[PDB]
Amino acid sequence: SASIWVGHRGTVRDYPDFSPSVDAEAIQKAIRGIGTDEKMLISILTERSNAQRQLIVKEYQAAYGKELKDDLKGDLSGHFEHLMVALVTPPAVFDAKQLKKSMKGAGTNEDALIEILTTRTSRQMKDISQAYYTVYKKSLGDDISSETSGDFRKALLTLADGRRDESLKVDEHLAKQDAQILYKAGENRWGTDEDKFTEILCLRSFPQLKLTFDEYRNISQKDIVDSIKGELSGHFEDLLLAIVNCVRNTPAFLAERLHRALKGIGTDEFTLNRIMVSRSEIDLLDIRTEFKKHYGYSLYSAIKSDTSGDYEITLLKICGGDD
Numbered sequence: 628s629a630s631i632w633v634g635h636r637g638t639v640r641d642y643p644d645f646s647p648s649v650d651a652e653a654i655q656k657a658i659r660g661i662g663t664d665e666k667m668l669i670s671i672l673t674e675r676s677n678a679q680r681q682l683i684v685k686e687y688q689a690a691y692g693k694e695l696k697d698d699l700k701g702d703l704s705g706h707f708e709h710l711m712v713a714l715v716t717p718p719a720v721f722d723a724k725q726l727k728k729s730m731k732g733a734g735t736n737e738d739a740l741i742e743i744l745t746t747r748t749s750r751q752m753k754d755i756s757q758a759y760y761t762v763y764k765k766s767l768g769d770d771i772s773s774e775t776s777g778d779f780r781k782a783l784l785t786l787a788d789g790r791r792d793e794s795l796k797v798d799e800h801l802a803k804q805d806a807q808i809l810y811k812a813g814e815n816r817w818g819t820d821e822d823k824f825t826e827i828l829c830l831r832s833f834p835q836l837k838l839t840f841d842e843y844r845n846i847s848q849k850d851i852v853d854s855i856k857g858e859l860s861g862h863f864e865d866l867l868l869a870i871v872n873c874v875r876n877t878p879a880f881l882a883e884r885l886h887r888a889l890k891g892i893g894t895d896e897f898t899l900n901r902i903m904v905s906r907s908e909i910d911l912l913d914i915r916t917e918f919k920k921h922y923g924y925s926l927y928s929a930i931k932s933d934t935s936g937d938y939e940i941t942l943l944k945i946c947g948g949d950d
Protein backbone atom coordinates (compact mmCIF):
# COMPACT_ATOMS: atom_id res chain seq x y z
CA SER A 628 0.00 0.00 0.00
CA ALA A 629 1.40 3.10 -1.49
CA SER A 630 -0.86 6.14 -1.08
CA ILE A 631 -3.10 6.77 -4.03
CA TRP A 632 -2.95 10.18 -2.45
CA VAL A 633 0.83 10.46 -2.36
CA GLY A 634 3.04 10.93 -5.41
CA HIS A 635 6.73 11.30 -6.21
CA ARG A 636 7.02 15.07 -6.63
CA GLY A 637 5.36 16.60 -3.58
CA THR A 638 6.88 19.44 -1.53
CA VAL A 639 5.56 18.07 1.78
CA ARG A 640 7.00 14.79 3.03
CA ASP A 641 6.92 12.71 6.17
CA TYR A 642 8.70 14.39 9.08
CA PRO A 643 11.13 11.67 10.22
CA ASP A 644 11.18 12.50 13.93
CA PHE A 645 7.44 12.63 14.29
CA SER A 646 5.73 12.02 17.62
CA PRO A 647 1.95 12.39 17.57
CA SER A 648 1.75 12.92 21.34
CA VAL A 649 4.34 15.68 21.32
CA ASP A 650 2.64 17.41 18.39
CA ALA A 651 -0.91 17.16 19.83
CA GLU A 652 0.24 18.58 23.18
CA ALA A 653 2.05 21.41 21.41
CA ILE A 654 -1.06 22.21 19.34
CA GLN A 655 -3.24 22.14 22.44
CA LYS A 656 -0.99 24.49 24.40
CA ALA A 657 -0.88 26.75 21.31
CA ILE A 658 -4.63 27.40 21.09
CA ARG A 659 -5.54 26.94 24.73
CA GLY A 660 -6.67 30.11 26.48
CA ILE A 661 -6.58 33.69 25.29
CA GLY A 662 -4.82 34.20 22.02
CA THR A 663 -3.27 31.66 19.79
CA ASP A 664 0.28 30.72 18.97
CA GLU A 665 -0.34 30.71 15.18
CA LYS A 666 3.41 30.45 14.63
CA MET A 667 3.50 27.12 16.51
CA LEU A 668 0.53 25.82 14.52
CA ILE A 669 2.25 26.78 11.28
CA SER A 670 5.55 25.26 12.35
CA ILE A 671 3.95 21.89 13.03
CA LEU A 672 1.19 21.34 10.50
CA THR A 673 3.12 22.51 7.43
CA GLU A 674 6.01 20.25 8.44
CA ARG A 675 4.02 17.04 8.78
CA SER A 676 2.57 14.98 5.92
CA ASN A 677 -1.25 14.51 5.78
CA ALA A 678 -0.90 10.93 7.11
CA GLN A 679 1.05 12.25 10.15
CA ARG A 680 -1.52 15.06 10.60
CA GLN A 681 -4.19 12.34 10.73
CA LEU A 682 -2.20 10.68 13.56
CA ILE A 683 -2.04 14.03 15.33
CA VAL A 684 -5.82 14.36 14.93
CA LYS A 685 -6.39 10.92 16.41
CA GLU A 686 -4.02 11.64 19.33
CA TYR A 687 -5.60 15.05 20.00
CA GLN A 688 -8.98 13.36 20.24
CA ALA A 689 -7.65 10.73 22.58
CA ALA A 690 -5.85 13.15 24.90
CA TYR A 691 -8.49 15.88 24.89
CA GLY A 692 -11.78 14.35 23.75
CA LYS A 693 -11.60 17.29 21.32
CA GLU A 694 -11.78 17.35 17.54
CA LEU A 695 -8.76 19.22 16.22
CA LYS A 696 -10.68 20.77 13.29
CA ASP A 697 -13.26 22.31 15.67
CA ASP A 698 -10.60 23.89 17.87
CA LEU A 699 -8.95 25.33 14.77
CA LYS A 700 -12.30 26.76 13.56
CA GLY A 701 -12.90 28.32 16.99
CA ASP A 702 -9.52 30.03 17.24
CA LEU A 703 -8.54 30.83 13.70
CA SER A 704 -10.16 33.18 11.24
CA GLY A 705 -10.13 33.92 7.53
CA HIS A 706 -7.94 32.44 4.82
CA PHE A 707 -5.46 31.22 7.41
CA GLU A 708 -8.26 29.26 9.09
CA HIS A 709 -9.48 27.72 5.85
CA LEU A 710 -5.95 26.74 4.87
CA MET A 711 -5.24 25.22 8.30
CA VAL A 712 -8.47 23.17 8.32
CA ALA A 713 -7.73 22.03 4.75
CA LEU A 714 -4.36 20.71 5.93
CA VAL A 715 -5.88 18.51 8.66
CA THR A 716 -8.62 17.14 6.37
CA PRO A 717 -8.05 13.65 4.83
CA PRO A 718 -7.45 14.02 1.08
CA ALA A 719 -10.56 12.21 -0.20
CA VAL A 720 -12.73 14.20 2.23
CA PHE A 721 -11.07 17.49 1.23
CA ASP A 722 -11.82 16.81 -2.47
CA ALA A 723 -15.41 15.73 -1.69
CA LYS A 724 -15.99 18.97 0.23
CA GLN A 725 -14.36 21.13 -2.45
CA LEU A 726 -16.71 19.46 -4.96
CA LYS A 727 -19.76 20.16 -2.79
CA LYS A 728 -18.59 23.71 -2.35
CA SER A 729 -18.31 24.20 -6.12
CA MET A 730 -21.96 23.23 -6.60
CA LYS A 731 -23.28 25.09 -3.60
CA GLY A 732 -25.92 27.76 -4.10
CA ALA A 733 -27.21 29.82 -7.00
CA GLY A 734 -24.15 29.34 -9.16
CA THR A 735 -21.85 26.41 -9.84
CA ASN A 736 -18.10 26.71 -10.05
CA GLU A 737 -17.62 24.85 -13.35
CA ASP A 738 -13.88 25.57 -13.38
CA ALA A 739 -13.38 23.92 -9.95
CA LEU A 740 -15.43 20.89 -11.05
CA ILE A 741 -13.35 20.65 -14.23
CA GLU A 742 -10.10 21.00 -12.32
CA ILE A 743 -10.79 18.27 -9.81
CA LEU A 744 -12.57 15.76 -11.97
CA THR A 745 -9.91 15.93 -14.65
CA THR A 746 -6.83 15.76 -12.44
CA ARG A 747 -7.84 12.96 -10.06
CA THR A 748 -7.08 9.35 -10.95
CA SER A 749 -9.83 6.68 -11.09
CA ARG A 750 -8.64 5.31 -7.78
CA GLN A 751 -8.78 8.72 -6.09
CA MET A 752 -12.22 9.28 -7.72
CA LYS A 753 -13.57 6.06 -6.17
CA ASP A 754 -12.29 7.30 -2.80
CA ILE A 755 -13.78 10.71 -3.32
CA SER A 756 -17.17 9.17 -4.21
CA GLN A 757 -17.14 7.14 -1.04
CA ALA A 758 -16.16 10.19 1.08
CA TYR A 759 -18.82 12.30 -0.60
CA TYR A 760 -21.45 9.78 0.36
CA THR A 761 -20.13 9.54 3.89
CA VAL A 762 -20.10 13.28 4.41
CA TYR A 763 -23.24 14.17 2.41
CA LYS A 764 -25.22 10.92 2.41
CA LYS A 765 -25.90 11.48 -1.28
CA SER A 766 -23.87 10.39 -4.26
CA LEU A 767 -21.59 12.87 -6.05
CA GLY A 768 -23.38 11.85 -9.29
CA ASP A 769 -26.78 12.97 -7.92
CA ASP A 770 -25.39 16.38 -7.04
CA ILE A 771 -23.60 16.75 -10.35
CA SER A 772 -26.77 15.72 -12.16
CA SER A 773 -28.72 18.50 -10.49
CA GLU A 774 -26.23 21.36 -10.86
CA THR A 775 -25.18 20.89 -14.46
CA SER A 776 -26.81 19.88 -17.72
CA GLY A 777 -26.23 19.09 -21.37
CA ASP A 778 -23.10 17.45 -22.59
CA PHE A 779 -21.14 19.03 -19.73
CA ARG A 780 -23.31 17.13 -17.27
CA LYS A 781 -22.94 13.81 -19.07
CA ALA A 782 -19.14 14.09 -19.27
CA LEU A 783 -18.83 15.04 -15.57
CA LEU A 784 -21.05 12.07 -14.66
CA THR A 785 -18.78 9.77 -16.67
CA LEU A 786 -15.64 11.08 -14.92
CA ALA A 787 -17.23 10.94 -11.43
CA ASP A 788 -17.73 7.20 -11.94
CA GLY A 789 -13.99 6.76 -11.88
CA ARG A 790 -14.22 4.19 -14.68
CA ARG A 791 -11.29 5.49 -16.80
CA ASP A 792 -9.13 2.55 -17.88
CA GLU A 793 -6.24 2.07 -15.47
CA SER A 794 -4.31 -0.49 -17.54
CA LEU A 795 -0.62 -0.04 -18.30
CA LYS A 796 -1.13 -1.74 -21.66
CA VAL A 797 -1.90 0.16 -24.84
CA ASP A 798 -3.64 -1.06 -28.00
CA GLU A 799 -2.39 0.52 -31.25
CA HIS A 800 -5.33 -1.07 -32.99
CA LEU A 801 -7.68 0.64 -30.56
CA ALA A 802 -5.96 4.03 -30.92
CA LYS A 803 -6.50 4.01 -34.68
CA GLN A 804 -10.13 3.01 -34.43
CA ASP A 805 -10.74 5.63 -31.81
CA ALA A 806 -8.91 8.33 -33.78
CA GLN A 807 -11.11 7.43 -36.80
CA ILE A 808 -14.20 7.58 -34.60
CA LEU A 809 -13.28 11.04 -33.28
CA TYR A 810 -12.61 12.23 -36.82
CA LYS A 811 -15.95 10.91 -38.06
CA ALA A 812 -17.78 12.27 -34.96
CA GLY A 813 -16.51 15.79 -35.46
CA GLU A 814 -14.51 17.35 -38.25
CA ASN A 815 -15.81 15.00 -40.90
CA ARG A 816 -19.47 15.79 -40.29
CA TRP A 817 -21.99 18.63 -39.98
CA GLY A 818 -22.42 19.16 -36.23
CA THR A 819 -20.80 16.80 -33.75
CA ASP A 820 -21.39 13.48 -31.99
CA GLU A 821 -20.58 14.91 -28.52
CA ASP A 822 -21.23 11.64 -26.75
CA LYS A 823 -18.44 10.01 -28.75
CA PHE A 824 -15.97 12.73 -27.67
CA THR A 825 -17.01 12.19 -24.09
CA GLU A 826 -16.69 8.42 -24.28
CA ILE A 827 -13.19 8.33 -25.68
CA LEU A 828 -11.66 11.24 -23.76
CA CYS A 829 -13.18 10.09 -20.47
CA LEU A 830 -12.70 6.30 -20.53
CA ARG A 831 -9.40 5.65 -22.27
CA SER A 832 -6.29 5.67 -20.09
CA PHE A 833 -3.87 8.64 -20.47
CA PRO A 834 -1.23 6.55 -22.24
CA GLN A 835 -3.85 5.17 -24.62
CA LEU A 836 -5.12 8.71 -25.26
CA LYS A 837 -1.61 9.87 -26.06
CA LEU A 838 -1.53 7.26 -28.84
CA THR A 839 -5.01 8.22 -30.00
CA PHE A 840 -3.97 11.89 -30.27
CA ASP A 841 -1.02 10.88 -32.44
CA GLU A 842 -3.21 8.80 -34.77
CA TYR A 843 -5.81 11.56 -34.86
CA ARG A 844 -3.22 14.05 -36.05
CA ASN A 845 -2.31 11.56 -38.79
CA ILE A 846 -5.89 10.98 -39.91
CA SER A 847 -7.03 14.59 -39.72
CA GLN A 848 -3.76 16.50 -40.19
CA LYS A 849 -4.93 18.62 -37.23
CA ASP A 850 -4.39 18.50 -33.50
CA ILE A 851 -7.23 17.14 -31.38
CA VAL A 852 -7.19 20.53 -29.63
CA ASP A 853 -7.99 22.26 -32.93
CA SER A 854 -10.89 19.90 -33.55
CA ILE A 855 -12.29 20.44 -30.05
CA LYS A 856 -12.08 24.21 -30.35
CA GLY A 857 -13.80 24.10 -33.74
CA GLU A 858 -16.57 21.62 -32.90
CA LEU A 859 -17.42 22.41 -29.29
CA SER A 860 -18.26 25.35 -27.09
CA GLY A 861 -19.00 26.36 -23.51
CA HIS A 862 -18.07 24.39 -20.42
CA PHE A 863 -18.08 21.11 -22.37
CA GLU A 864 -15.32 22.48 -24.60
CA ASP A 865 -13.41 23.64 -21.49
CA LEU A 866 -13.69 20.20 -19.91
CA LEU A 867 -12.41 18.29 -22.94
CA LEU A 868 -9.50 20.77 -23.43
CA ALA A 869 -8.71 20.25 -19.70
CA ILE A 870 -8.64 16.50 -20.29
CA VAL A 871 -6.24 16.98 -23.24
CA ASN A 872 -3.92 19.27 -21.27
CA CYS A 873 -3.95 16.86 -18.32
CA VAL A 874 -3.04 13.98 -20.59
CA ARG A 875 -0.13 15.99 -21.91
CA ASN A 876 0.97 17.85 -18.82
CA THR A 877 -1.04 17.86 -15.64
CA PRO A 878 1.40 20.05 -13.63
CA ALA A 879 1.28 22.75 -16.36
CA PHE A 880 -2.55 22.66 -16.39
CA LEU A 881 -2.51 23.17 -12.60
CA ALA A 882 0.29 25.79 -12.84
CA GLU A 883 -2.09 27.64 -15.13
CA ARG A 884 -5.01 27.46 -12.67
CA LEU A 885 -2.71 28.84 -9.95
CA HIS A 886 -1.62 31.59 -12.29
CA ARG A 887 -5.21 32.71 -12.96
CA ALA A 888 -6.01 32.48 -9.22
CA LEU A 889 -3.17 34.86 -8.36
CA LYS A 890 -3.67 37.34 -11.22
CA GLY A 891 -6.25 39.93 -12.17
CA ILE A 892 -8.26 41.87 -9.62
CA GLY A 893 -8.34 39.80 -6.45
CA THR A 894 -6.78 36.51 -5.55
CA ASP A 895 -8.98 33.44 -5.62
CA GLU A 896 -7.92 32.09 -2.23
CA PHE A 897 -10.08 28.96 -2.62
CA THR A 898 -8.47 27.81 -5.86
CA LEU A 899 -5.08 28.64 -4.40
CA ASN A 900 -5.76 26.75 -1.17
CA ARG A 901 -7.17 23.74 -2.96
CA ILE A 902 -4.30 23.32 -5.44
CA MET A 903 -1.60 24.11 -2.85
CA VAL A 904 -2.97 21.58 -0.36
CA SER A 905 -4.23 18.81 -2.64
CA ARG A 906 -1.08 18.62 -4.77
CA SER A 907 1.44 19.24 -1.99
CA GLU A 908 2.21 15.51 -1.65
CA ILE A 909 1.74 14.67 -5.28
CA ASP A 910 3.26 17.01 -7.83
CA LEU A 911 3.61 20.50 -6.44
CA LEU A 912 7.34 20.34 -7.32
CA ASP A 913 6.47 19.86 -11.01
CA ILE A 914 3.74 22.49 -10.80
CA ARG A 915 6.46 24.83 -9.49
CA THR A 916 8.74 24.00 -12.40
CA GLU A 917 6.00 24.46 -14.95
CA PHE A 918 4.84 27.74 -13.38
CA LYS A 919 8.31 29.22 -13.56
CA LYS A 920 8.87 27.91 -17.10
CA HIS A 921 5.64 29.44 -18.25
CA TYR A 922 5.48 32.75 -16.32
CA GLY A 923 9.11 33.63 -15.88
CA TYR A 924 8.85 33.95 -12.11
CA SER A 925 8.55 31.36 -9.34
CA LEU A 926 5.37 30.33 -7.57
CA TYR A 927 7.12 31.36 -4.35
CA SER A 928 7.38 34.99 -5.53
CA ALA A 929 3.83 35.02 -6.92
CA ILE A 930 2.63 33.96 -3.44
CA LYS A 931 4.77 36.56 -1.77
CA SER A 932 3.40 39.35 -3.93
CA ASP A 933 -0.30 38.58 -3.58
CA THR A 934 -0.68 37.29 -0.07
CA SER A 935 0.29 38.40 3.38
CA GLY A 936 0.36 37.58 7.08
CA ASP A 937 0.06 34.06 8.50
CA TYR A 938 -1.81 33.01 5.35
CA GLU A 939 1.23 33.93 3.20
CA ILE A 940 3.69 32.19 5.52
CA THR A 941 1.67 28.99 5.48
CA LEU A 942 1.46 28.98 1.67
CA LEU A 943 5.19 29.61 1.42
CA LYS A 944 5.90 26.71 3.74
CA ILE A 945 3.69 24.46 1.62
CA CYS A 946 5.35 25.78 -1.57
CA GLY A 947 8.66 24.66 -0.09
CA GLY A 948 11.23 26.88 -1.72
CA ASP A 949 11.96 29.24 -4.53
CA ASP A 950 12.70 28.42 -8.16
Ligand SMILES: [Ca+2]
Binds near residue numbers: 658663
Ligand atom coordinates in the same frame (compact mmCIF):
# COMPACT_ATOMS: atom_id res chain seq x y z
CA1 LIG B 1 -6.99 30.56 22.02
Ligand SMILES: [Ca+2]
Binds near residue numbers: 734
Ligand atom coordinates in the same frame (compact mmCIF):
# COMPACT_ATOMS: atom_id res chain seq x y z
CA1 LIG C 1 -25.30 25.51 -7.33
Ligand SMILES: [Ca+2]
Binds near residue numbers: 812817
Ligand atom coordinates in the same frame (compact mmCIF):
# COMPACT_ATOMS: atom_id res chain seq x y z
CA1 LIG D 1 -18.46 18.92 -37.26
Ligand SMILES: [Ca+2]
Binds near residue numbers: 818819820821
Ligand atom coordinates in the same frame (compact mmCIF):
# COMPACT_ATOMS: atom_id res chain seq x y z
CA1 LIG E 1 -24.65 16.76 -31.60
Ligand SMILES: [Ca+2]
Binds near residue numbers: 856859860864
Ligand atom coordinates in the same frame (compact mmCIF):
# COMPACT_ATOMS: atom_id res chain seq x y z
CA1 LIG F 1 -15.21 26.61 -29.56
